[PDB]
Design a protein around this nucleic acid. Structure first.
Ligand SMILES: [Mg+2]
Ligand SMILES: [Mg+2]
Ligand SMILES: [Zn+2]
Ligand SMILES: [Zn+2]
Ligand SMILES: [Zn+2]
Lengths: 417, 310, 515
RNA sequence: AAAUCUUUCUCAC
RNA sequence: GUGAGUAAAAUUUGG
C-alpha cells in the first residue's frame, strides 16, 4: 500500500465492466471505489475473478500476500502479470509512459561510492608511456622478401625428401601390397596389437621440440583430395589400415605404457600417428617380400586432424582459379624455373596450406593484401609483419610459411604491382 | 527432493526465461567435432531415417519463384528487407493447430535484414536472396510509406535510403549542395546550378521544385538566368553515395542536413484497441454483447476472447 | 595462390588455426604485457583527451535485458570451500542461477536494485554481501580462442563472473547507446559493408586515407580510462564498482591466481574503449581497435597521431598503412568512390562438417558472393555442382546413409544433383528446402544440437518447459507446480489432435504457402 | 615415437 | 549406457 501507485492504478481501469456495467476493477486508493469492511491486500480488486492486483516497479517487490496478483512494470516499457487478461489490460491502458517515483537510475550514487573511489585512488595507477616516432615510407620491395626467404632458408635448411608431403602421389603399389606394407611397418616399430588394431606406446618424452626444416615440393599432388578424405576418416576410425582408390593410410593411437592395465581405447584427447606411403628413394624406405615403399609419419592431435581432414581442396582450387593470373613454373625449392619448373607444384603448395593446422599462410596473405593496397607504411615495422617464424613451430608450418613468402616473391617478380 | 528445488535452491519462484535457459537444445555451433559426433552410434543415420519416415511427409509444398526483371550491374549498395511478424490471432491459431510454440513465438517480432547487393533495375526493386544477378524480385509492396519515415525523427521501418535511415537517395528525393560559390540542386533526373547576384536566385530553371525550396531556404527571389553554369559537379557521385541519417526532425524548410551546407528534400512533403487474448472460450466469463463498453468477452462470430479498451 | 589473385584476397578459403595447446602461456604473456604497459615503458595507458562533449545518461532508467544474461557460453563461478577460492567453469545460465540463489533474488534486475541500495558493504544480500560480491567477481579463468584466421599463435580469452557480466552488460548497453547518439555511423542496424560504405563517403573529401589498427588494444585500456568514460556518460556507482573489480582482477592460470592490474582482458568493454577515442574527436571512424581517418597534409597526420596517442589508441606500426585509392575497414575493402574492390576479398570456404549442413553453408556463401558481385552466377553454379560432387565423395557411405531414394542428394545415397538456381528458386523436392539458406535447419544441425544439449556442462534433469504459448511472457515467474500444470495441459491438447511431438515451423515456407 | 609440459581422470549402478 | 566427483570432460572457447 504505497501512494506512488495511486495514479498508476487510477488509469489502469478506466471503465472496465464485469457483469453488465459495474466496474470490474475497484481501486483501493479511492474511497468511492474501495470496498468497505474488508482489508486491503492489493492495489485493485477484480470482481469477476475476485482477485487482487498489485503494481510494483522492476525488481522492487511490495509487502503483499502471495495470493495477490503482482503486476510488475519493467523499465523498458513492458509490463507483467500472472493473468494474461490483466497483462493485456495494463499494456493497452498504459500506452502513456508515466514515470513513477522510486525507479533506480543508472547514474544512481550508492552509499559506498566514496569508499570505493578512495580504495581505487589508493590502488596503483599506470604511468604515461613514451610518444612514438613514426616514419612513413614506401612499402617493402622485392629485395626485402628475398632477404626474408634467404634468412629462413639459411636458418632452417631443407629436408632431403618431402616427407609426408610426398604422400600426395601414388606409391606404385596395389591395395593388397599397400595394406601388407603398412601392417608390416607397424609390426616392425614394435607397435602393440590389440583388438585387431595397432597402438603406439610411449613411456618417456625428451620434452624438446622436434627438428624442423623445409620440405621440398614434389612434382604434383593428384591425390590431395583422397589424402584429405583418408586423414579425416582415419583419426575417427583409428587402429586399422584405411584404403582409398589409389592410396591407403594407417592411423595408430598413441597412448602411455603404464603396465598390465595401461589403456585399451583412445580418448577424445588421444593423439594419432598417421602413416602414409610414397615412392621409394629416401631414408624412409621400407622393404618386405619384394615390395618397397617410402613410409612417412605425421603426429597429429585430434583438433589438428579434424582441421586438416575437413578442408575442401577441389573447391578451393576452383575458387582460386576463378580470378587468378598465370602461375609461373617453380622448382623444388620454390624458385622460379622457366626452363625445368612445373606449374603443378602450385597444387602441392595448396596441399601444404591444407596440411598446416597453424595456417600461417593466412597471416602472410593478410599482410600481402595490406602490402598491395598500401601506399605508405611505417618504417622498419611493416616489414617485420612478414617475420612469423617465432609465431610457429614445426616442419609443416615452417614449410608453409616459407612457401607463402616464396609465393609473394614470385608474384612480385612475375606480375609487379 | 525435486529437481526444481535442487536447481533453484532457496527460491520457490523463477522467471520463465531462466527456467527455459536451463533446457535449451536448439542451438547449433560449427565445430571441428561434427564428423565424429555424427558418426558416433550412427546418430545421423537414425535421424535421417526418422526424418524420411516420420517428418518428411509433413512439409508443405510451396511454390517456386517465377517473377524476375531485367537487371544490370551497378554500384554496391545496401538492401533492407522487412519481414513482418505474425499477428496475435495468427500466432494463437498456429499454436492451437499444434505447431511448435517456440518457433511461432520467435517469429512474432518484425525482422529487418541487411544485404549488400551490386545489381539494380530500372524500377529499383528488391531481389531474393542470391538471385539479384538473375533479377528475381520480392513482389511485395508493404505500403512503402517513406513519407512517414522522412518526417519522423526515428522512422519505424528503414527502407535502406537516406529518407528513412543510412543509405543513398531515392527517386522522389533531391538534394541541394553548395559547391564553392554555387548551389547544385539534383533530383536524380535533372541537375541545375543556382547563384545569387544581389538578392535573387539566378538559375536556368527557377520553376524547379528544388530551386523553389533553395530560394525559400535562402530567402531570395527566383530569377531566370541561363548564364549561370558550373565547371563540373559530383552530383551523380553524392546521389549514389550513402550518408548517415540524423535522428532529428525536418527543418521548417523541410530539409534535413546530410552534409556540409547540404540538405535533402522530399517532393511529396511540403476508438478501441480491440485485442484477441486467445482462440478459446474461458469458463466463467461474460458473453460478447452488442455494445461492450470496456470489458473482455467471448465472440461467437470468431471463437476468441476479445478485450475492448476505451 | 592467394598471392596471384588479380584483385584483393585475404586468403580466407581455408579454416582458421587450431590446436590443443594449453591457454596458460598466452594468458601469461598478455598479463606480462599489461604489467609492462603499466610501468610506462612500452605503450601509453594514461588517457589525456577531454570527454566533456559526451552526453550524460545518469538520469536514464536502469534497465537490464535478461536474455543476454543467460547463455550456453562458458563462465566462471567462485565458491569458498573452507577459506580458499575455487573457480569452476560452468555455463553462463548456471552461473547466473547460482548467483541468484546465493543472493535470493528472483531476477537480475532485482539483484542490481538490491545491490545499489545497501547502507554499507558489510550488509547482507541473501547469503552474501556487496564486499564479498566484489571480491568474488574479480576472478577470471583463461581459455584459448582458436580458429582466428591470420593468427598462427592463438590468443587467450577470459571467462568472468556472473556479477561482472551483469555490470558489464549494463554499462556496455549504455555505452552503445551513447555511441549511437554521438555519430550516426554507429546505428544498431548497420552491416560491415554498410559501415564501410558510409566511411568511404565520409573520407572521400581528403586525399590520403589512414587505415589503422591498435596494437595490444586490450592491455592498453586501463581501469582509469574506463572509469573516466563511465563518469563522462554518467554511470554512477556501477562504473565505480566495475573499475574497482577490473583494477583488482585476478586470472586463474592453470592452478595459480595471477594479478593483472592493467588492461580490460580481451574485449570485456568494446563500446567504452571506442568512446575513449570517439569522445575526444570527431575525425575518426573507429570500431573496437580498427579505425580509419583522412588527411591532406603532414600536419594533419601529426594531429591524427597526437589524438590517437592522447586517446590511448596506440597505433600499430605493423599493420597500419596509408592509401589513396583503397579504403579498408571491418575487413571490407572499397574504392574511394564507394564501390567494392574486385577480387575474392573476405570470401571464406565451407569445410566439410556434415552432408547437408555443408551444402547449406555453401549455398549461403555463394548467394552472398553473387549478390555482391564477387563472382558471376554461372561460376557460382559450377562451384555448387563441384561442392555437391565433393560431398558425395565424402558422405556417400553406409556409415551416413542406408537409403537410395531418387530425390535424395548423391551424398545421401540418391541420384539428384540439384542446380544452384533451382535450389534458390525453390524448384526442388521439399527435402531440399533445408539446404536453402533461408530454409529450416538440416537434419545434421538438429542432431548436433540435441547431442550438445546432453553434454556434462549443460545436461540437466529438469523437466523441459518447451513449446510455450506465444502470449505468455518469457519473463513471468513460475513454480514447479506451474511448470507441471502447463506441461500437462500442452501434452493433453496435443493428444487431442493426434500428435506426440510439435510440428517444426518455418516462417519462410509458411508465408510462401499462404494463399 | 612426434607439429614434444601434450599424447590425460576417479567412483557407483 | 546411466549417473556422480575433481579449478576440465570436448556446444570445448569469452566479449
Ligand atoms: Mg590491433
Ligand atoms: Mg583489428
Ligand atoms: Zn622420406
Ligand atoms: Zn525511404
Ligand atoms: Zn552538380
Amino acid at each position: 500500500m504505497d501512494s506512488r501507485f495511486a495514479q498508476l492504478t487510477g488509469v489502469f481501469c478506466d471503465d472496465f465492466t464485469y457483469s453488465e456495467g459495474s466496474r470490474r476493477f475497484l481501486s483501493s486508493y479511492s474511497t468511492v471505489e474501495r470496498r468497505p469492511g474488508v482489508p486491503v491486500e492489493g492495489d485493485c480488486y477484480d470482481c469477476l475473478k475476485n482477485k487482487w492486483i498489485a503494481f510494483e516497479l522492476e525488481g522492487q517487490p511490495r509487502k503483499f500476500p502471495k495470493a495477490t496478483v503482482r503486476c510488475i512494470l519493467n523499465n523498458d516499457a513492458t509490463y507483467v502479470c500472472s493473468e494474461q487478461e490483466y497483462q493485456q489490460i495494463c499494456k493497452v491502458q498504459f500506452k502513456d509512459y508515466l514515470e513513477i517515483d522510486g525507479v533506480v537510475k543508472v547514474g544512481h550514487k550508492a552509499s559506498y561510492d566514496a569508499e570505493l573511489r578512495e580504495r581505487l585512488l589508493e590502488l596503483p595507477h599506470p604511468k604515461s608511456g613514451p610518444k612514438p616516432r613514426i616514419e612513413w615510407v614506401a612499402p617493402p620491395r622485392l629485395a626485402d622478401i628475398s632477404k626474408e626467404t634467404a634468412e629462413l632458408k639459411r636458418q632452417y635448411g631443407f629436408f632431403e625428401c618431402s616427407k609426408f608431403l610426398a604422400c600426395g602421389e601414388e606409391c606404385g603399389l596395389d591395395q593388397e601390397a599397400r595394406e601388407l606394407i603398412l601392417n608390416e611397418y607397424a609390426r616392425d616399430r614394435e607397435f602393440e596389437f590389440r583388438n585387431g588394431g595397432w597402438i603406439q606406446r610411449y613411456t618417456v618424452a625428451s620434452h624438446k621440440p622436434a627438428t624442423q626444416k623445409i620440405l621440398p615440393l614434389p612434382a604434383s599432388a593428384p591425390l590431395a583430395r583422397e589424402l584429405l578424405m583418408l586423414i579425416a576418416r582415419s583419426t575417427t576410425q583409428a587402429g586399422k589400415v584405411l584404403h582409398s582408390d589409389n592410396t591407403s593410410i594407417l592411423a595408430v593411437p598413441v597412448m602411455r605404457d603404464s603396465g598390465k592395465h595401461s589403456k585399451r581405447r583412445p580418448t577424445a584427447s588421444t593423439h594419432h600417428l598417421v602413416v602414409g606411403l610414397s615412392k621409394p628413394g629416401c631414408e624412409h624406405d621400407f622393404e618386405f617380400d619384394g615390395y618397397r615403399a617410402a613410409v612417412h609419419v605425421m603426429h597429429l592431435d585430434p583438433k589438428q586432424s579434424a582441421n586438416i581432414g575437413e578442408q575442401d581442396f577441389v573447391s578451393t582450387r576452383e575458387i582460386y582459379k576463378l580470378d587468378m593470373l598465370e602461375l609461373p613454373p617453380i622448382s623444388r625449392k620454390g624458385d622460379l624455373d622457366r626452363a625445368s619448373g612445373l606449374e603443378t607444384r602450385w597444387d602441392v603448395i595448396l596441399l601444404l596450406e591444407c596440411l598446416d593446422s597453424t595456417r600461417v599462410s593466412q597471416a602472410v596473405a593478410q599482410h600481402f593484401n595490406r602490402h598491395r593496397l598500401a601506399l605508405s607504411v611505417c618504417k622498419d615495422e611493416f616489414r617485420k609483419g612478414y617475420q612469423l617464424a617465432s609465431e610457429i613451430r614445426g616442419t609443416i608450418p615452417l614449410s608453409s610459411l616459407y612457401y607463402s613468402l616464396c609465393a609473394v616473391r614470385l608474384r612480385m617478380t612475375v606480375h609487379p604491382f | 527432493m525435486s529437481q526444481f528445488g535442487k536447481s533453484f535452491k532457496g527460491r520457490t519462484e523463477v522467471t520463465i526465461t531462466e527456467y527455459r535457459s536451463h533446457t535449451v537444445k536448439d542451438v547449433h555451433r560449427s565445430l571441428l567435432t561434427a564428423d565424429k559426433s555424427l558418426r558416433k552410434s550412427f546418430c545421423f543415420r537414425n535421424a535421417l531415417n526418422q526424418f524420411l519416415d516420420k517428418d518428411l511427409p509433413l512439409l508443405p509444398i510451396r511454390p517456386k519463384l517465377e517473377s524476375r526483371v531485367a537487371v544490370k550491374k551497378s554500384k554496391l549498395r545496401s538492401q533492407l528487407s522487412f519481414r513482418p511478424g505474425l499477428t496475435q490471432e495468427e500466432a494463437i491459431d498456429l499454436y492451437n493447430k499444434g505447431y511448435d510454440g517456440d518457433s511461432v513465438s520467435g517469429a512474432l517480432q518484425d525482422r529487418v535484414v541487411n544485404e549488400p547487393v551490386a545489381y539494380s533495375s530500372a524500377d529499383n526493386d528488391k531481389f531474393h536472396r542470391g538471385l539479384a544477378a538473375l533479377g528475381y524480385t520480392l513482389a511485395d509492396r508493404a505500403f512503402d510509406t517513406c513519407e512517414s519515415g522522412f518526417v519522423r525523427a526515428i522512422p519505424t521501418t528503414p527502407c535502406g535510403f537516406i529518407c528513412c535511415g543510412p543509405g543513398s537517395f531515392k527517386d522522389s528525393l533531391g538534394f541541394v549542395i553548395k559547391i564553392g560559390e554555387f548551389w547544385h540542386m539534383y533530383d536524380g533526373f535533372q541537375h541545375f546550378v543556382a547563384v545569387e547576384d544581389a538578392k535573387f536566385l539566378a538559375s536556368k530553371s527557377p520553376s524547379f521544385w528544388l530551386a523553389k525550396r533553395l530560394a525559400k531556404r535562402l530567402n531570395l527571389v527566383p530569377k531566370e538566368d541561363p548564364s549561370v553554369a558550373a565547371a563540373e559537379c559530383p552530383c551523380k557521385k553524392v546521389w549514389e553515395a550513402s550518408f548517415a541519417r540524423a535522428p532529428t526532425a525536418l527543418d521548417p524548410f523541410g530539409g534535413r542536413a546530410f552534409c556540409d551546407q547540404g540538405w535533402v528534400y522530399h517532393r511529396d512533403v511540403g476508438k478501441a484497441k480491440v485485442t484477441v487474448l486467445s482462440r478459446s472460450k474461458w469458463m466463467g466469463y461474460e458473453d460478447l454483447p452488442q455494445k461492450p463498453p470496456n470489458g473482455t468477452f467471448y465472440c461467437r462470430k470468431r471463437k476468441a476472447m476479445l478485450l475492448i479498451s476505451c | 595462390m592467394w598471392a596471384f589473385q588479380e584483385g584483393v584476397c585475404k586468403g580466407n578459403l581455408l579454416s582458421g588455426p587450431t590446436s590443443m595447446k594449453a591457454p596458460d602461456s598466452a594468458a601469461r604473456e598478455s598479463i606480462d604485457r599489461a604489467s609492462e604497459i603499466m610501468t610506462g615503458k612500452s605503450y601509453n595507458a594514461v588517457h589525456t583527451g577531454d570527454l566533456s562533449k559526451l552526453p550524460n545518461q545518469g538520469e536514464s532508467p536502469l534497465r537490464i535485458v535478461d536474455s543476454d544474461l543467460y547463455s550456453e557460453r562458458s563462465c566462471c563461478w567462485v565458491i569458498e570451500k573452507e577459506g580458499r577460492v575455487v573457480c569452476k567453469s560452468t555455463t553462463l545460465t548456471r552461473g547466473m542461477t547460482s548467483l541468484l540463489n546465493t543472493t535470493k533474488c528472483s531476477s537480475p534486475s532485482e539483484l542490481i536494485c538490491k545491490v545499489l541500495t545497501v547502507e554499507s558493504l558489510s550488509e547482507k544480500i541473501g547469503d552474501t554481501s556487496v564486499e564479498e560480491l566484489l571480491s568474488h567477481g574479480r576472478y577470471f579463468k583463461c581459455a584459448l580462442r582458436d580458429q582466428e584466421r591470420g593468427k598462427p599463435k592463438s590468443r587467450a580469452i577470459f571467462l568472468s563472473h556472473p556479477f561482472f557480466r551483469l555490470l558489464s552488460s549494463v554499462v556496455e548497453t549504455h555505452a552503445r547507446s551513447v555511441l549511437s547518439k554521438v555519430s550516426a555511423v554507429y546505428t544498431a542496424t548497420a552491416s560491415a559493408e554498410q559501415r564501410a560504405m558510409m566511411a568511404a563517403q565520409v573520407v572521400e573529401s581528403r586525399k590520403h586515407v589512414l587505415n589503422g589498427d591498435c596494437t595490444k588494444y586490450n592491455e592498453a585500456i586501463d581501469a582509469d580510462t574506463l572509469l573516466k568514460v563511465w563518469d563522462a556518460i554518467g554511470m554512477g556507482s556501477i562504473g565505480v564498482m566495475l573499475a574497482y573489480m577490473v583494477r583488482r582482477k585476478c586470472v586463474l592460470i592453470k592452478d595459480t591466481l595471477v594479478e593483472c592490474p592493467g588492461g580490460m582482458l580481451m574485449g570485456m568493454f568494446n563500446a567504452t574503449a571506442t568512446l575513449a577515442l570517439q569522445g575526444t574527436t570527431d575525425r575518426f571512424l573507429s570500431f573496437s581497435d580498427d579505425f580509419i581517418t583522412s588527411f591532406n597534409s603532414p600536419a594533419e597526420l601529426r594531429e591524427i597521431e597526437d589524438l590517437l596517442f592522447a586517446s590511448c589508441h596506440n597505433l600499430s606500426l605493423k599493420k597500419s598503412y596509408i592509401s589513396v585509392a583503397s579504403l579498408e575497414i571491418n575487413s571490407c575493402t572499397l574504392t574511394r568512390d564507394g564501390d567494392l574492390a574486385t577480387g575474392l576479398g573476405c570470401t571464406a570456404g565451407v569445410p566439410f562438417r556434415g552432408p547437408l549442413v555443408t551444402l547449406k553453408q555453401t549455398a549461403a556463401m555463394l548467394s552472398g558472393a553473387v549478390d555482391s558481385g564477387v563472382m558471376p552466377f554461372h561460376s557460382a553454379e559450377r562451384l555448387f555442382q563441384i561442392k555437391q560432387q565433393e560431398c558425395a565423395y565424402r558422405y556417400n557411405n553406409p556409415t551416413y546413409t542406408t537409403r537410395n531414394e531418387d530425390f535424395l542428394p548423391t551424398c545421401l545415397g540418391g541420384k539428384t544433383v540439384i542446380s544452384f538456381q533451382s535450389l534458390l528458386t525453390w524448384d526442388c523436392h521439399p527435402f531440399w528446402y533445408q539446404v536453402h539458406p533461408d530454409g529450416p535447419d538440416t537434419i545434421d544441425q538438429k542432431v548436433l544440437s540435441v547431442l550438445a544439449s546432453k553434454t556434462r556442462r549443460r545436461r540437466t534433469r529438469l523437466e523441459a518447459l518447451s513449446d510455450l504459448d506465444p502470449l505468455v511472457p518469457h519473463r513471468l515467474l513460475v513454480s514447479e507446480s506451474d511448470v507441471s500444470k502447463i506441461r500437462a495441459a500442452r501434452q493433453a491438447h496435443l493428444k487431442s489432435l493426434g500428435l506426440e511431438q510439435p510440428t517444426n515451423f518455418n516462417y519462410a515456407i509458411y508465408k510462401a504457402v499462404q494463399p
